[PDB]
Structure formats: structure tokens, C-alpha cells
């Protein structure tokens, strides 16, 4: 308990001010009224996952009907429709190269599909196994190395070509429900269902900083564009922006009308807007500097289960349990 | 922009083919019914799944079965390859037709845990609209335990002493009064949780079964018929 007390004392000492008070001089973003430019419909069942390609145009949406649909967001044309061996898929990804798309879920197996194949179709390029729990978030590092967050309280780092668990990250007391990568792709922050988000070094394989302050299960993590901070959404309906430099909580986003936990979060390319999908069927965009609810993205008949901001910052994709994925700009 | 027009035409053709495949998949997916097979880990689940298979394959932990009754295809899945925390992977099963809840009613020590799990399933935010097919198992074991009388349910459930067999009970062949009273007490204990909330969104179907019972398929078929009949009645605005 001495180490925990010392860490708390250091965090309190470093807590010399509040982010809201410092940013009060900065003018607020006002009211944000993003509209649905495109509605990407065609999913049979609820959409559990979302990711944008590095080209900032293509989209991958995973649905518990066992469907990995690669949409062209510009034209609302399903470029690909990969059927999955396991119907219940909770994670999806784009490789940075774009030639591979990952999926996973209750099958405990991360399936990597080769999109750009010489045959002229989509096939299971790899089937990584070794996790003892459901996969909640798997994302590529360099298109030949994938970090997967599972429900066995441990994260894994696999070499796709080798197909073996090269690195294992342990220390979470609960199921990991989110996983985000720094823009430098050297450290990644994984949040478990224990109100704890741990930052792991990819090469070292051990946690460097554990962040607490949440009250319930963490369901979503996104990185700040600068890579020195990360926002976590949890079941206590409150987002928390932690700063790596301060090694403690920096900002809290909450309200009185919110009584439902966050499902997916996604920062804006500038970091001024923190987007967060909620269980109340509506997404919310917050001013990360001012902690004020900048705006609401309604329009989903069910809860917003996945939320992704494109690399170009031009649009957002909100996929809900109503088998609908909407594009906002 | 001839090349751009050709690329757009090819994109539209591929999207049309994918959409036709998706329409076929939608027909097949709506035609098939998903049944989340839940219950305490002590007993009931795997034996039922295997028996339904003998009437369809699990590799990484989820024991799936794609049995068909009459002309309707059912998908029952026993998700067993998961560590401890049903809270997070239960969310996914909010699109299933029903949750087949297998309760080892012969073991009174773990009966309270099964009741708490049933209450959590019933009162879960995402399982409000998902009906539960109660499937109290090992009725032969429960009858043998009651007839032997080694352990009394009054020790585990004091309210059983004041409980009396309901007038609407339908005793089986033989049906010793102690056995019938115990079985219907467990059924009423689960149905109290079932009726405490739901306001007509979903209903619990309390079927008693055994390990070697061959009527389980018909029970699930009739329960799914009633579930989708009520779903249509809500959809058709017939209350």
C-alpha cells in the first residue's frame, strides 16, 4: 500500500491546476451540428465494430450476422462482404497497408483476411489462436504484427507470418474491452473491465503506467493525436482523459442527463473534439479542452456500438446495434 | 472520364452482386433462430447440446448446434470457452430469439446462484426483450433426492415450508406429492423473478426436462413459436 500511497501523493502534487480552468481562456467550440451525409445500410444484424483504412475512404464494419463488410464510404458501395466462421464478432481492423482486415470475438481466434489477393477474392490469410477468452479489440501495428485485446485479462502481440504469440501483456484484473495505439505505434493503452487502463510498451512487453479513476468497466479507449494522452469511456457513463506525462487523470466528461455507459470513443484529428458513443442510442461530441458537451449525434434506433474518426478528419462513422452505420461530416 | 465511368460501373456491379448475396443471407438468417444456451456450469448445458446433436460443431469453446425441427432451423450455442465474467459477452446475445436457461434443480446448494443469474439475465438492459426458456434439468435426480430426503429444501429455502402446490399444477405419471411440490416450488421461485419485471416485453417458459428427454426439441420449438407470435403481436400492434 506504500507504493499506491506514494503514487497518489505524487499525482496530487502534480495536480497543480484544472484543465477546464486553464482552457477557460480558449474560446469554446460552440454548437456542432454534424449531419448524416451517408447511411451505409445492408448489415443483417447489429454492428459490433468499426475501423477506417489508412486511405481515409474505405470502411470495415463487423456484424454479429458473421459479416465483415468493406464499404466505400464515398459511394456507399459494399466493396467486400466477407462471411465469417463465427457469427459473433466484436472486433474489426484495417491494416495500415490496407491489404489485410482482422476480426475476432467470442471464437477467441483472431482471423486475418487478405483483401488484396491475387486470386480475386477474400480468404482467411491467418487464424491466430492462443487467447483463452473473447476478443474485444484487435488492431494492426505494421500489417505484419497485430495486437489483440481479449477477455482473458491479457493482451497479446502476434506475428501474423509466424502465427505465434510473440508477446503477452498481463496485469489487468478484468476482461480487456478496448485497445488503442499511439501514433508512433510504440506504446498501446488497453483498458480492462476493472476501471483500469494500462499503457504497455510494444518492445518491452510490460506495463509502464497504470491509470485508475474510473468506477466501472472501461468499454472504449482512443488516443490523443499528440500521443501523450488518451480518453477512456466506461460503464459509469463518464469519460476520462488521462495524460501520460502527468501519469494521472487530467479531465472528466460527465453530465446529469447521462445515465448509460459509453460503448465506443474516438478523438478528433486535432484532439479538440472527443466523440463517444453512448448506450442511450445517441453519440456525443465533447470539447476535450472545455469538458463541455459540444453536440449530439442522434439518428440511431439502437445503441451506438462502434465509433470511428477517419484519419483525414473529414468524416465520422457511427455503427449502432440497429444494423445501421452512418457517416457524419 | 471513360476510365472513371468504367470503374464506377464495376463498383456498382460488385455492389449489386454483394447485395444479392446479402439478400440471400438475410433470408437464411431470418429463417434461422439463435438460442443462447445459458445456465450454471455445474450441469445441464453440454449434455443438452449433445442430445440435440444426436437428433453443428464447436472448436474453440463455443459448442454450437444447428438442429432443425420440422422445417425451421435453430441455432443453439453453448458459449463455454470464456473465463468468468458473463457480463460483457452477454451483451452480444441481445439479438437471439431466446435464452434456453438450463437450471440444475436437483442441486439446491447452487440453486440460489442459478436464481441470481436468472435475475441478472432478466433485468439486464440488453436482455429485456429476449425471452427465456426455463429448462429445469435432472428432474429424475431431483425426484430421487426428494424421495430419499437426505437434504431438505427448507434448509436452503425457508419459504418452502410455507409453500403449497398450486391448484394449476399438472403432475406427471407417478408424481409423488413431495417431488411435485419441490419441482413446482423451484418453478415458482424462478417465475417470481420472471414476473417481477418485464411488463410484457418477454416471458419465461418453465419446462421441466431430464438428461435423456427426447421432447426437448419440441419444447424449444413451441417456445420459439410463442416468442415470435408475441413479437409479431407487438409488431402488428395487436397489443
Amino acid at each position, epitope marked *: 500500500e506504500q507504493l*499506491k500511497n506514494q503514487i*497518489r501523493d505524487a499525482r496530487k502534487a502534480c495536480a497543480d491546476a484544472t484543465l477546464s480552468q486553464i482552457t477557460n481562456n480558449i474560446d469554446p467550440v460552440g454548437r456542432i451540428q454534424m449531419r448524416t451525409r451517408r447511411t451505409l445500410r445492408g448489415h443483417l444484424a447489429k454492428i459490433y465494430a468499426m475501423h477506417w483504412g489508412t486511405d481515409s475512404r474505405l470502411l470495415v464494419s463487423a456484424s454479429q450476422d458473421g459479416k465483415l463488410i468493406i464499404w466505400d464510404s464515398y459511394t456507399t458501395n459494399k466493396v467486400h462482404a466477407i462471411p465469417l466462421r463465427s457469427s459473433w464478432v466484436m472486433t474489426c481492423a484495417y491494416a495500415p497497408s490496407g491489404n489485410y482486415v482482422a476480426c475476432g470475438g467470442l471464437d477467441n481466434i483472431c482471423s486475418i483476411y487478405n483483401l488484396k489477393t491475387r486470386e480475386g477474392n477474400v480468404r482467411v490469410s491467418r487464424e491466430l489462436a492462443g487467447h483463452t477468452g473473447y476478443l474485444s479489440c484487435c488492431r494492426f501495428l505494421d500489417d505484419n504484427q497485430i495486437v489483440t485485446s481479449s477477455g482473458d*485479462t491479457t493482451c497479446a502481440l502476434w506475428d501474423i507470418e509466424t502465427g505465434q504469440q510473440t508477446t503477452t501483456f498481463t496485469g489487468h*484484473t*478484468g476482461d480487456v474491452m478496448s485497445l488503442s495505439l499511439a501514433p508512433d505505434t510504440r506504446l498501446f493503452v488497453s483498458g*480492462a*473491465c*476493472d*476501471a*483500469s487502463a494500462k499503457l504497455w510498451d510494444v518492445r518491452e512487453g510490460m506495463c509502464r503506467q497504470t491509470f*485508475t*479513476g474510473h*468506477e*466501472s*468497466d472501461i468499454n472504449a479507449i482512443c488516443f490523443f493525436p499528440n500521443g501523450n494522452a488518451f480518453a477512456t469511456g466506461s*460503464d*459509469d*457513463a463518464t469519460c476520462r482523459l488521462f495524460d501520460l506525462r502527468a501519469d494521472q487523470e487530467l479531465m472528466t466528461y460527465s453530465h446529469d442527463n447521462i*445515465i*448509460c*455507459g459509453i460503448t465506443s470513443v474516438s478523438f478528433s484529428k486535432s484532439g479538440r473534439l472527443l466523440l463517444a458513443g453512448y448506450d442511450d442510442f445517441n453519440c456525443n461530441v465533447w470539447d476535450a479542452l472545455k469538458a463541455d458537451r459540444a453536440g449530439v449525434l442522434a439518428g440511431h434506433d439502437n445503441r451506438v456500438s462502434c465509433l470511428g474518426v477517419t484519419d483525414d478528419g473529414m468524416a465520422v462513422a457511427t455503427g449502432s446495434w440497429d444494423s445501421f452505420l452512418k457517416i457524419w461530416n | 472520364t471513360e476510365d472513371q465511368r468504367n470503374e464506377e460501373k464495376a463498383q456498382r456491379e460488385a455492389n449489386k452482386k454483394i447485395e444479392k448475396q446479402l439478400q440471400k443471407d438475410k433470408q437464411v438468417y431470418r429463417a434461422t433462430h439463435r438460442l443462447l444456451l445459458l445456465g450454471a456450469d455445474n450441469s445441464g448445458k453440454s449434455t443438452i447440446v449433445k442430445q440435440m446433436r444426436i437428433l453443428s460443431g464447436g472448436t474453440s469453446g463455443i459448442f454450437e448446434t444447428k438442429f432443425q425441427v420440422d422445417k425451421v432451423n435453430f441455432h443453439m450455442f453453448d458459449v463455454g470457452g470464456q*473465463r*468468468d*465474467e*458473463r*457480463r460483457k459477452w*452477454i451483451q452480444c446475445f441481445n439479438d437471439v430469439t431466446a435464452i434456453i436457461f438450463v437450471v440444475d434443480s436437483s442441486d439446491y*446448494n447452487r440453486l*440460489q*446462484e442459478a436464481l*441470481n443469474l436468472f*435475475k*441478472s*439475465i*432478466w*433485468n*439486464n*438492459r440488453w436482455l429485456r426483450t429476449i425471452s427465456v426458456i426455463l429448462f429445469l434439468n435432472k428432474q429424475d435426480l431431483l425426484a430421487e433426492k426428494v424421495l430419499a430426503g437426505k437434504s431438505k429444501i427448507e*434448509d*436452503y*429455502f*425457508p*419459504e418452502f415450508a410455507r409453500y403449497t402446490t398450486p391448484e394449476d399444477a399438472t403432475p406427471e405419471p407417478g408424481e409423488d406429492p413431495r417431488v411435485t411440490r419441490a419441482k413446482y416450488f423451484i418453478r415458482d421461485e424462478f417465475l417470481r423473478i420472471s414476473t417481477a*419485471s418485464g411488463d410484457g416485453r418477454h416471458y419465461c417458459y418453465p419446462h421441466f426436462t431430464c438428461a435423456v428427454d427426447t421432447e426437448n426439441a419440441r419444447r424449444i420449438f413451441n417456445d420459439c413459436k410463442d416468442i415470435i407470435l408475441q413479437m409479431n403481436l407487438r409488431e402488428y400492434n395487436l397489443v
Partner: nanobody
Amino acid sequence: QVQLQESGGGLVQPGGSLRLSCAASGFTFSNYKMNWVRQAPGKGLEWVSDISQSGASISYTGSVKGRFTISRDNAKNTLYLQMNSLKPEDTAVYYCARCPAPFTRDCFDVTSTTYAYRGQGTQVTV
């Protein structure tokens, strides 16, 4: 940091009174449904009692339904389980389990001990 350190316990004669308390800190505690759970020596882990956010809708395991009155003080930010009677079968390690989702009526705590929103526990013997 979520903490649920338990106080009260130790050896007690059968039929005695041994009130347990939890110092629930790190969350609002005014909305989370709370539970008392017990682990017998070498025998699994069984839920004992439950109590809603407002203190009503209290329920207990039938084995201790008559005794073991549960209570919750939001202003004091604490929760107590008064054991009116004690039996040798009640000798176990008692933990306080917080419901995971705040404003929900369901509790999905863990059976084989891995739950995080749970105290270290206090051992009571008869």
C-alpha cells in the same frame, strides 16, 4: 482507485452477533447495487445478500434469510451486514461486491474469484 476494505470479523461463538462493515471508496456508491458474498473454506464462492441503491429491495440467501440483516448508509458511504445469529456453517471469508453497472438492476459478479470491484474480505469463524 476502487476500494472496498472490510472491517469486523474474527472468531465468535455460535449464535453470537458479528456486524461487518465495508469502507466503499472510489465511486459514488449512491447508485450501485451492493452485495455481500461469502467463500466457505475450500468451497466455492456464494452470494449472501443484495441491496439496491436506495436501500430497499433487500434480499438474502435463503440459508441466512432470517438472520443477517443488511443495511446501507449513503451519507456515511458505508454498508453493513449485522449477523443476528451465527452457525458453524457461517464460518467463511466475507467480501463486499459492487454491481458493475451503476444504474442497473442486475449484478454480474464473479464466481471463481477474479472480480475487481470487491473487497479483500474478512474471515469469520465459529
